[PDB]
């Protein structure tokens, strides 16, 4: 086993192979631990999540702070943060995976490049390399940066995201709410006028699939 791993990937090959809590250590370092939910089981597992939509519970609403930092219930419904995706972004080439789920259906999509920067960028989105079931929704969304109402698309749709013009992916919009725009929607899949009961986003070193 890793000491220190630095995602799930390194934490799952440390034969941790039921989906649950891990501590992970950014770049390795015992003094950067973080607590993340690894998805060992989607794809090959290995996956830090660091979005999950499932019951409407969790207030996406929040603030560039709350965004910055993360907020939520690991195990339930929760968002990582925007400083902790940076970080993991930024210590290797890491693949982005999203896991949809609405009414037994069930989609995904997989792009192969996957940052997010510091700060200095609004933690810009780069998202590349699209394959799957969903269809390509984040590709309109890529080398955007973070809106929050506070930092417009957040407010006039009440969620946040790497908003454009405004949105094909609105994963941290309101749950439930089928009118036009306002909820869980990837677009290029149930369009906007359909609320996903269930979405996932996560991450992994794109070099897992053959390590
Ligand atoms: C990342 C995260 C999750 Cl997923 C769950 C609950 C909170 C947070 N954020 C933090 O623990 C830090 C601690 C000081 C401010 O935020």
């Known amino acids: 086993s890793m000491p220190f791993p630095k995602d799930c990937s390194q934490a799952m090959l ?8 891990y501590t992970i250590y950014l770049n390795g370092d015992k003094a950067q631990a973080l607590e993340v939910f690894c998805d060992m089981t989607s794809d090959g597992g290995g996956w ?10 969790e207030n996406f609403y929040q603030n560039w702070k709350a965004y910055a930092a993360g907020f939520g219930d690991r195990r339930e419904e929760f968002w990582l943060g925007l400083d902790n995706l940076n970080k993991i972004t930024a210590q290797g080439q890491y693949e982005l995976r999203v896991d949809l789920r609405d009414h037994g259906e069930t989609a995904f999509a997989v792009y192969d490049k996957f940052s997010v920067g510091d700060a200095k960028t609004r933690y810009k989105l ?19 940066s973070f809106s929050t109402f506070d930092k417009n698309c957040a407010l006039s749709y009440k969620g946040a995201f790497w908003y454009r013009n405004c949105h094909r992916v609105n994963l941290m919009g309101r749950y439930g709410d089928n009118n036009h725009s306002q909820g869980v929607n990837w677009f290029h899949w149930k369009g906007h006028e359909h609320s996903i009961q269930f979405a996932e986003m996560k991450l992994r070193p794109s070099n897992f699939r053959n390590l």
């Open 48 to 57: 830090i999540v660091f979005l999950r939509r499932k019951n409407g519970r």
């Open 14 to 21: 440390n034969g941790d192979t039921t989906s649950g809590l």
């Open 126 to 144: 780069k998202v590349e390399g699209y394959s799957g079931t969903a269809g390509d929704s984040m590709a309109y969304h890529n080398g955007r």
